[PDB]
Amino acid sequence: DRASKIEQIQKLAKYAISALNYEDLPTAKDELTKALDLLNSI
Amino acid sequence: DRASKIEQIQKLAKYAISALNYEDLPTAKDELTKALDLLNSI
Amino acid sequence: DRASKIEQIQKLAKYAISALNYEDLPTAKDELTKALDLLNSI
Amino acid sequence: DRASKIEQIQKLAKYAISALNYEDLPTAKDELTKALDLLNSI
Amino acid sequence: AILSEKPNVKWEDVAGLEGAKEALKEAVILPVKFPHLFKGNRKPTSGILLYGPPGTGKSYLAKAVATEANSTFFSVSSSDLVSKWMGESEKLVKQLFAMARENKPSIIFIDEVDALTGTRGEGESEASRRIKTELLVQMNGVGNDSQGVLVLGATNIPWQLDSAIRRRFERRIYIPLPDLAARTTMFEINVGDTPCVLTKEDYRTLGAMTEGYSGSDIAVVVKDALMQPIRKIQSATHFKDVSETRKLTPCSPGDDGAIEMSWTDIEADELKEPDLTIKDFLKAIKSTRPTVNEDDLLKQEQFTRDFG
């Protein structure tokens, strides 16, 4: 972990980006969050 | 705006990703934030 | 007649079809009816 | 459905026509009916 | 006997799955953009596999690589490789990589490599052992110049692909089902110069309606849509004048100025084609089922989840 936690944030922040490509704010505001919380979990 | 605000979040969330590629948590926790706040500004 | 009545039902049932090609239910429900009544008139 | 129901009436009303080409009133009076009822089901 | 083309397809022509896009921009454009970085220990990729469900645009993306390649882009299906005799089935492979090295720098594409693999068991014995053996040894071996040419593999069945050829295709990429925005883009591309009727969020409604298609599915619903108002004109009785001197369009039986006639009755030009609008689109969506299956997607998530 960590080396992966740092890798999963990116995985999240990507999905989030991919989500805004359909204006899906819901998913976005969530993944961009599950990600941030985790960067604090670091 | 908006059509752009939605475009600048992605711009942020990218930089954030690019930042974690040097383990730079500082930048990350910031851009991934300036972005989120803005998705709420939507 | 008859040989024609049988020919006019088809004439109707066609118009009806042609009508649904514009979603015109009104015309349809009518021609598909003027036709049916006539097949009973046979 | 609907976009199809509207398409199946035509499918019916065709068979009905095709049927009268053998003077088969039975089939006709039926398909031209299963169709009409369905245009009311719309 | 051997085909070649410099096609039209661009990266902007391709819509969707940008990780494979930047991967091929790296492994193909990076030898073009910076050949001087690749020297000694740093070597370009020799074997790249694309795979997944059918109709996802792997050959089309290979044509994008072809246009931005500036190289002798070969491409072959299995049909130029199946054994009819007992030995042009193999010498043609030898001449394929031979003339591929003759036209170096070059790119080779093979579509559906699953027809050449599967050494496990003894089924499809002589063709599989001889032709597949020559694909292995001739792909790299004793004195093959593995530099230069690039081997692009496609398939729909990657688990029946043998592990040795799986290692030969050293950089493999899964191609998933695409998303909402890319199919919106392919709708707005494939409508082309035809005068449409809808807006961008209506194409978003279309892509929301069409959850889980392929690129060919989009190509045929757009194709059927380019039959739809023409199908209105070829249908039915009754037209009507509207509005530069006389202009008539199809209308229902009994309407404001509804004459009874056929298209044949109506004068050159002075026809008013129905607008192109969605009800025809949604009717075409209700016309055709998605072809692909989801348990096959579960196996693609199995092999992708492991080896991807």
Ligand SMILES: Nc1ncnc2c1ncn2[C@@H]1O[C@H](COP(=O)(O)OP(=O)(O)O)[C@@H](O)[C@H]1O
């Ligand atoms: N990602 C994509 N972007 C643009 N067009 C696509 C894409 N995927 C498929 N298509 C369209 O689908 C058509 C057929 O795809 P094809 O290359 O036969 O799929 P396969 O991957 O099975 O070879 C192509 O003409 C292409 O225009």
